[PDB]
RNA sequence: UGUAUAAAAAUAGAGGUAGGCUACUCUCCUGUAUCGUAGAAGAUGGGCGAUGGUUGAUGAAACGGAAGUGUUUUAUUGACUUGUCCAUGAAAUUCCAGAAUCCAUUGCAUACGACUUUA
RNA sequence: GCGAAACCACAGCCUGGGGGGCCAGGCAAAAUCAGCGG
RNA sequence: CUGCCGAAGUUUCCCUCAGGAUAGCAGAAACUCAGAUCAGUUUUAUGAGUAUGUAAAAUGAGAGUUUCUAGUGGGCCAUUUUUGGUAAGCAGAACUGGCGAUGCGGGAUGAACCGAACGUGAGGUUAAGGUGCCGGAAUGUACGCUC
């Protein structure tokens, strides 16, 4: 049963925003477990995916993935900023993400 | 993915890697140094085994021919006595790695 | 100040346990239990001394020490030899009829200044009422806790009141005579 | 209140760079600042607040304001070392600490260790 | 973070005044530059020596001679308020002379909402004798038999985790 | 205007009266009923002695208007169970009798005769 | 971060628990609160009453009175409930009275950052939401108390069976000879 | 994508320990825990050790009403039984991707709807 | 059955703050008929 | 349609009347010195009464001129004195700015408040303002006061 999951779960909190302006260019990711700004230095540079589904059966799979990279730490509590190839849609606020362990540094 | 293996030799950025084929069924392969999780398990004898017969042209695309099976078997022959000597290594190589829940990758080391 | 200590010398009693902010004090007369969660205090029972200590406390919490000490003295004396509250009756014109029910736990008073109300008082538990035949109109209030006996005396006093009249002309009523221990 | 700030009580620092090291209160500066020291060379004497520390049960007799050498003499005489480790509280900390610097191979052996422990499940 | 600053200076010598007198001050300042500013303020309001005719001969910083030795400090100060004059004398017990003043700034701006410019430090002295101490809480803190449980029990051990939302058990806090 | 409490002045949603408030239960008392439902037929007036103590009309003759309500005996056909819950009274289950009176079967059906009488 | 979590609300502060809860809901976590009666508010009981009689005085609103409905109001003020982001975050928060059966068999976590003991100076006045609302128009104070006692009987009985069961495995744990190797690995 | 984990109570204290209402001793000071965890996505076998574990189908019996979303006692069943030790296979995926309404009737109703009847 | 005209930037829930459009709140379920305020 | 440049918002006078002005600000052409020529600047030297004016080194800048041709001569806000005032507002000038032609961040909302002057985008970093939640960012550290 537990012979999978070589990634780390996360959540797409929101866009890196001012008070009244959202900058959809870069999102905010909270990795499940990160708890400091020094902690996020490990997760910087990793690859993060947002796995969603749709009715179209492209290449025999309803499942689609939007790629992304952890870019820099955000704040003092351990959230990071991510730059995805396609800006994550505004409807995934709170949805689940996977920060896979590669590219590694150890 | 998730298959603990042993590195055979360094081939510029990529790594010529394989596990004991009798143990994990991992053929000799190239893996980028960014897709490897190096562990702190005790070192394995690799100096004695032959590694010079591995070049990027050898792995490059031109049904696997027999001698490719043979030299891997030869490499296993030079690697099996070591893993037999050190306890728990043989089954550890066979074991597959996964992240049990409630585990922090940064904290727990390798 | 950072410390404020109070000491109590335990009399005979039987047990003075402070188990879980609840003094279930048992004396030779009987057992009484009260809560102590009303204030946050350290109460240690050891030997013949009970230590009440305030640590870095304000004057508001400091004032609770002597109140608790006065409180703790009340039932421990009650459970040892008991408490008796002597009641005296004064009537101007209409004699007051007093009856005791369930061995005095409930007192009904009748014929109060011409009024025709059977004023019934269910005295609080732990206190019973008796009529003394040694002296007329003498009512004995026996209990093991002053605040309960006194409150019943206060209740019987307030229900024994005059309405819309002159106090200095009408003298009938019930009033506190004196306190004391049972023995 | 078994945890009692007393001159000479042992304390265990839980915050700051000296986290986890044992030391003993030497002098009470005030209700928010205190002076502590330890013979261990890794711990220099310093004035530490009460926010970073939790009080321990073990108390060793110690005259007020003793120098580090005298404190070291008193500690060594009173064998406080390995007396703290006698407590069941202590044994869990290094058990957590030893698990910290494990590696993957040590973790797998533990999996072998615990699996062989569970297989018995022998109950009458 | 304040520092002790022994500041010595004199006015510019001239033909009328060939040898100016070296004044000295032990005043506190977060940096060297603030020490000069407080110096000119302290002296000009008092001795009336002009800024432009003054030079400073030496700025030194005084480390606490015996920081590890607990001490009681007497601090004469002058409150400035709506009235502007109050001979207040506070006392603090701590280890470092600078640390005592920090707390005095902490208390003066907390108890009385004072401001650094408004408050001028008069004199800071050590109180070596318990008899010389005048404060009951300090006197009680100086007693031979000091003993008290660690106050604010929650502040000890606090929660002790990184981000411990949803702890699985109640905290003892005792 | 009239009373503010009786507002709104909308037509009743029930054809027949519904008892919203019932007497409090008492296990000490024996089992007894609490409500009845009959039919109002009309009214007349009656002559009755007025034995009201202390009144000026004491022990003498008074005329009082009366109403006549026919109350044929009902048929107990079932029982229901109610559970006191943090959301109020909830219906737990309901058990009935075997041979329901044919009028009751009319209640469940808006078009009894056309229906195949499949109730219960 | 489990998909569904249960927060015991006994001894938690209404305002500081809600702020923690409101954020978790916007994160997408399905948070369910239980025992909403025993919530706490800073300030003596009569004060929190008067601040509530102002709420009832404010009228055209629907002054929901049950303790769960008090907490749900508290969360609804920390969500953007006008937008479909908060309108879909409100529906995950299920606040109940006491502990319904489908949750009394689930482990209940507590928020360290909003417990009464860790956040209030000793001796400070405070009120219990359950008692307060029962004096504002709630009518189910007594029934939930009786039901909670009954569950406590079953839960306590459940522990005793489990306590003996783990004691058996506690007694048989030392029989394993690998305990020495367990000590060497610190496990 | 382990959808793993159910006393309570208090924080100026609780729990456990054996005896005859307790003496005394112990535990607490976090879950950085406890439980589960290999297998070409989990193969085929061979032994050695134990009457176990894990499940699927059950035969059920008992329990659970606060929203019973189930829990247990389990007899049963045939699998799987890494408990430990051996042999076979992976690969050029050769660097991540039955009812009701209307028509019809009634009048306890009714601006028209609607409502109460009957059919 | 026959059948208009005025009128029409866009529309239409209230409290408070700067009116119906702004800010913060309360709330928020279609389609309609009848009496009738602003 | 795009681009470039871009004000005054006021003195001066004349003037029965409305205005007319000269000047300033904005430009376009033709000509001198490679200047110690200027400067919403300060010094040097003062003289007189801490200020005041004056003439004579620092710093920056290429500074100039004659000629014509538009537009403009409103007001609002806040400071300085200020004389006249009083339940209290005020009343009056002189003076200085900014808004008037100007988006942007913050101040919940906003004509004058706090920051900041705008080609089109990328990254980095700040200002004022802030970090319980709505809401991006510590349910931070330390010392205190308040029911």
From Swiss-Prot, chain A:
Ribonucleoprotein in keyword set: yes
Gene Ontology cellular-component terms listed: cytosolic large ribosomal subunit; preribosome
Record's function text: Component of the ribosome, a large ribonucleoprotein complex responsible for the synthesis of proteins in the cell. The small ribosomal subunit (SSU) binds messenger RNAs (mRNAs) and translates the encoded message by selecting cognate aminoacyl-transfer RNA (tRNA) molecules. The large subunit (LSU) contains the ribosomal catalytic site termed the peptidyl transferase center (PTC), which catalyzes the formation of peptide bonds, thereby polymerizing the amino acids delivered by tRNAs into a polypeptide chain.
Family of the protein in this entry: Belongs to the eukaryotic ribosomal protein eL33 family.
Residue ranges of the TM segments: none
GO MF entry, a single one: structural constituent of ribosome
Tagged with keyword NADP: no
Lineage: Eukaryota, Fungi, Dikarya, Ascomycota, Taphrinomycotina
Species, as recorded: Schizosaccharomyces pombe (strain 972 / ATCC 24843)
The protein, known as: Large ribosomal subunit protein eL33B
Gene3D superfamilies associated with the record: translation elongation factor selb, chain A, domain 4 (2.40.10.190)
SUPFAM superfamilies, per database record: Translation proteins
Subunit details: Component of the large ribosomal subunit (LSU). Mature yeast ribosomes consist of a small (40S) and a large (60S) subunit. The 40S small subunit contains 1 molecule of ribosomal RNA (18S rRNA) and at least 33 different proteins. The large 60S subunit contains 3 rRNA molecules (25S, 5.8S and 5S rRNA) and at least 46 different proteins.
Compartment list: Cytoplasm
Swiss-Prot record, chain D:
Location, primary (coarse class): cytoplasm
Gene Ontology MF terms: RNA binding; structural constituent of ribosome
Keyword Ribonucleoprotein (UniProt): yes
Transmembrane helix listed as a keyword: no
Subcellular location: Cytoplasm; Nucleus
CDD domains in UniProt: eL14
Any GO BP annotation: cytoplasmic translation
GO CC entries: cytosol; cytosolic large ribosomal subunit; nucleus; preribosome
Source superkingdom: Eukaryota
Record keywords: Cytoplasm, Nucleus, Ribonucleoprotein, Ribosomal protein
InterPro entries: KOW (IPR005824), Rib_uL2_dom2 (IPR014722), Ribosomal_eL14 (IPR039660), Ribosomal_eL14_dom (IPR002784), Translation_prot_SH3-like_sf (IPR008991)
Subunit-structure text: Component of the large ribosomal subunit (LSU). Mature yeast ribosomes consist of a small (40S) and a large (60S) subunit. The 40S small subunit contains 1 molecule of ribosomal RNA (18S rRNA) and at least 33 different proteins. The large 60S subunit contains 3 rRNA molecules (25S, 5.8S and 5S rRNA) and at least 46 different proteins.
Family indicated by similarity: Belongs to the eukaryotic ribosomal protein eL14 family.
Protein name listed in UniProt: Large ribosomal subunit protein eL14
Organism lineage: Eukaryota, Fungi, Dikarya, Ascomycota, Taphrinomycotina
From Swiss-Prot, chain E:
SUPFAM superfamilies registered for this protein in UniProt: RplX-like (SSF160374)
Annotated protein name in UniProt: Large ribosomal subunit protein eL20A
Domain of life: Eukaryota
Organism, as annotated: Schizosaccharomyces pombe (strain 972 / ATCC 24843)
GO molecular function: structural constituent of ribosome
Pfam family, one: Ribosomal_L18A
Note: There are 2 genes for eL20 in S.pombe.
Stored Gene3D superfamilies: 3.10.20.10
Location within or outside the cell: Cytoplasm
GO cellular component, one term: cytosol
Protein function: Component of the ribosome, a large ribonucleoprotein complex responsible for the synthesis of proteins in the cell. The small ribosomal subunit (SSU) binds messenger RNAs (mRNAs) and translates the encoded message by selecting cognate aminoacyl-transfer RNA (tRNA) molecules. The large subunit (LSU) contains the ribosomal catalytic site termed the peptidyl transferase center (PTC), which catalyzes the formation of peptide bonds, thereby polymerizing the amino acids delivered by tRNAs into a polypeptide chain.
Gene Ontology terms describing biological process: cytoplasmic translation
Main location: cytoplasm
Entries under InterPro entries matching the protein: Ribosomal_eL20 (IPR028877), Ribosomal_eL20_dom (IPR023573), Ribosomal_eL20_eukaryotes (IPR021138)
Family designation: Belongs to the eukaryotic ribosomal protein eL20 family.
Keywords of the record: Cytoplasm, Ribonucleoprotein, Ribosomal protein
Organism phylogeny: Eukaryota, Fungi, Dikarya, Ascomycota, Taphrinomycotina
From Swiss-Prot, chain F:
Disordered: annotated span: 1-24
Feature: compositional bias, Basic residues: 8-21
Segments forming a coiled coil: none
Residues modified as Phosphoserine: 3, 55
Subcellular location: Cytoplasm
Annotated function: Component of the ribosome, a large ribonucleoprotein complex responsible for the synthesis of proteins in the cell. The small ribosomal subunit (SSU) binds messenger RNAs (mRNAs) and translates the encoded message by selecting cognate aminoacyl-transfer RNA (tRNA) molecules. The large subunit (LSU) contains the ribosomal catalytic site termed the peptidyl transferase center (PTC), which catalyzes the formation of peptide bonds, thereby polymerizing the amino acids delivered by tRNAs into a polypeptide chain.
Miscellaneous remark of the record: There are 2 genes for uL3 in S.pombe.
Assembly description: Component of the large ribosomal subunit (LSU). Mature yeast ribosomes consist of a small (40S) and a large (60S) subunit. The 40S small subunit contains 1 molecule of ribosomal RNA (18S rRNA) and at least 33 different proteins. The large 60S subunit contains 3 rRNA molecules (25S, 5.8S and 5S rRNA) and at least 46 different proteins. uL3 forms together with ES39L one of the contact sites for the signal recognition particle that targets ribosomes to the endoplasmic reticulum membrane.
Family that this chain belongs to: Belongs to the universal ribosomal protein uL3 family.
Protein name per UniProt: Large ribosomal subunit protein uL3A
Gene from which the chain derives: rpl301
Full protein stretch here: 11 to 130 of 388
């Amino acid at each position: 049963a537990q012979g999978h999951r070589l990634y780390v779960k996360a959540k797409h909190l929101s866009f890196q925003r001012s008070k009244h302006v959202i900058h959809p260019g870069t999102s905010i990711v909270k990795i499940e477990g990160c708890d400091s700004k020094e902690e996020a230095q490990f997760y910087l540079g990793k690859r993060v995916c947002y796995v969603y589904k749709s009715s179209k059966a492209v290449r025999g799979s309803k499942i689609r993935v939007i790629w992304g990279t952890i870019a820099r730490p955000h704040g003092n509590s351990g959230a990071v900023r991510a730059r995805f190839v396609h800006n994550l849609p505004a409807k995934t606020f709170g949805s689940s993400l996977r920060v896979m362990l590669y590219p590694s540094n150890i | 993915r998730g298959k603990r293996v042993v590195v055979l030799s360094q081939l510029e950025d990529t790594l010529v890697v394989t596990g004991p084929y009798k143990v994990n069924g991992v053929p000799i392969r190239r893996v980028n140094h960014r897709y490897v999780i190096a562990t702190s398990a005790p070192k394995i004898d690799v100096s004695g085994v032959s590694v010079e017969k591995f070049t990027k042209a050898y792995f490059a695309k031109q049904a696997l021919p027999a001698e490719r099976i043979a030299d891997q078997k030869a490499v296993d022959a030079k690697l099996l006595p070591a893993i037999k000597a050190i306890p728990n290594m043989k089954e550890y190589l066979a074991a597959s790695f996964a992240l049990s829940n409630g585990d922090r990758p940064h904290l727990m080391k390798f | 100040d950072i410390y404020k200590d109070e000491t109590l010398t335990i009399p005979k009693g039987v047990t003075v346990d402070i188990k879980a902010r609840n003094v279930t004090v048992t004396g030779p007369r009987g057992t009484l239990k009260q809560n102590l969660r009303h204030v946050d205090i350290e109460m240690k029972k050891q030997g013949n001394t009970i230590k009440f200590i305030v640590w870095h406390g304000s004057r508001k919490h400091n004032a609770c020490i002597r109140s608790v000490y006065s409180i703790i003295n009340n039932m421990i004396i009650g459970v040892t030899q008991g408490f008796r509250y002597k009641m005296r009756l004064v009537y101007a014109h209409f004699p007051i009829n007093i009856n005791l029910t369930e061995n005095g736990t409930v007192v009904e008073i009748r014929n109060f200044l011409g009024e025709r109300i059977t004023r019934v008082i269910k005295c609080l538990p732990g206190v019973t009422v008796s009529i003394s035949s040694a002296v007329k109109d003498e009512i004995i209030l026996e209990g093991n806790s002053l605040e309960n006996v006194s409150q019943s005396a206060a209740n019987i006093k307030q229900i024994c009141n005059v309405r819309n009249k002159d106090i200095r002309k009408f003298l009938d009523g019930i009033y506190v005579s004196e306190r004391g221990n049972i023995e | 209140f078994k945890r009692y700030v007393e001159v000479g009580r042992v304390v265990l620092v839980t915050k700051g760079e000296y986290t986890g090291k044992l030391a003993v209160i030497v002098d009470i500066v005030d209700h928010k600042r205190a002076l502590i020291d330890s013979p261990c060379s890794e711990f220099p004497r310093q004035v530490i607040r009460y926010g970073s520390v939790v009080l321990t049960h073990i108390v060793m007799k110690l005259p007020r304001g003793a120098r580090s050498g005298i404190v070291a003499k008193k500690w060594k005489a009173q064998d406080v070392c390995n007396k703290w480790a006698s407590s069941a509280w202590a044994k869990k900390l290094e058990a957590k600490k030893v698990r910290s610097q494990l590696n993957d191979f040590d973790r797998f052996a533990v999996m072998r260790l615990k699996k062989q422990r569970r297989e018995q499940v022998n109950v009458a | 973070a304040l520092k002790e600053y022994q500041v010595v200076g004199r006015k510019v010598p001239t033909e009328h005044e060939p040898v100016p007198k070296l004044f000295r001050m032990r005043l506190f300042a977060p940096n060297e530059s603030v020490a000069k500013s407080r110096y000119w303020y302290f002296l000009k309001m008092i001795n009336k020596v002009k800024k432009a005719t003054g030079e400073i001969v030496a700025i030194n910083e005084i480390s606490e001679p015996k920081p590890l030795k607990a001490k009681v400090f007497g601090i004469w100060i002058r409150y400035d308020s709506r009235s502007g004059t109050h001979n207040m004398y506070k006392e603090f017990r701590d280890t470092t002379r600078v640390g005592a003043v920090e707390a005095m700034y902490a208390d003066m701006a907390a108890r009385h909402r004072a401001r650094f410019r408004s408050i001028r430090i008069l004199k800071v002295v050590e109180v070596e004798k318990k008899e010389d101490v005048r404060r009951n809480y300090v006197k009680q803190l100086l007693n031979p038999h000091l003993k008290f449980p660690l106050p604010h029990r929650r502040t000890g051990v606090v929660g002790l985790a990184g981000k411990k939302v949803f702890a699985p058990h109640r905290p003892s806090t005792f | 205007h009239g009373s503010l409490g009786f507002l709104p002045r909308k037509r009743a949603s029930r054809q027949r009266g519904k008892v919203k408030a019932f007497p409090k239960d008492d296990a000490s008392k024996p089992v007894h009923l609490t409500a009845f439902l009959g039919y109002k037929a009309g009214m007349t007036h009656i002559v009755r002695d007025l034995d009201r103590p202390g009144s000026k009309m004491h022990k003498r003759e008074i005329l009082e208007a009366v109403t006549v309500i026919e109350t044929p005996p009902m048929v107990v056909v079932g029982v229901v169970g109610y559970v006191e819950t943090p959301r109020g009274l909830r219906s737990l289950t309901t058990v009935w009798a075997e041979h329901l009176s044919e009028e009751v079967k009319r209640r469940f059906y808006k078009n009894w005769f056309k229906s195949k009488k499949k109730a219960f | 971060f489990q998909k569904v979590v249960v927060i015991d609300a006994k001894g938690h502060l209404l305002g500081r628990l809600a702020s923690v809860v409101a954020k978790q809901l916007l994160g997408g976590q399905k948070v369910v609160v239980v025992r909403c009666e025993e919530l706490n508010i800073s300030g003596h009981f009569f004060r929190n009453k008067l601040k509530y009689l102002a709420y009832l005085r404010k009228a055209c609103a629907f002054h929901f009175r049950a303790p769960s409905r008090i907490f749900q109001k508290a969360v609804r003020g920390m969500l953007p409930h006008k937008t479909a982001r908060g309108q879909a975050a409100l529906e995950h928060l299920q606040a109940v009275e006491g502990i319904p059966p489908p949750f009394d068999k689930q482990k209940r976590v507590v928020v360290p950052a909003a417990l009464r003991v860790l956040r209030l100076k000793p001796g400070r006045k405070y009120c219990t939401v359950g008692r307060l609302s029962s004096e504002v128009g709630w009518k189910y104070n007594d029934i939930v108390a009786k039901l909670e006692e009954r569950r406590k009987v079953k839960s306590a009985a459940f522990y005793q069976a489990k306590l003996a069961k783990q004691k058996k495995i506690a007694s048989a744990k030392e029989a394993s000879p690998v305990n020495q190797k367990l000590s060497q690995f610190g496990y």
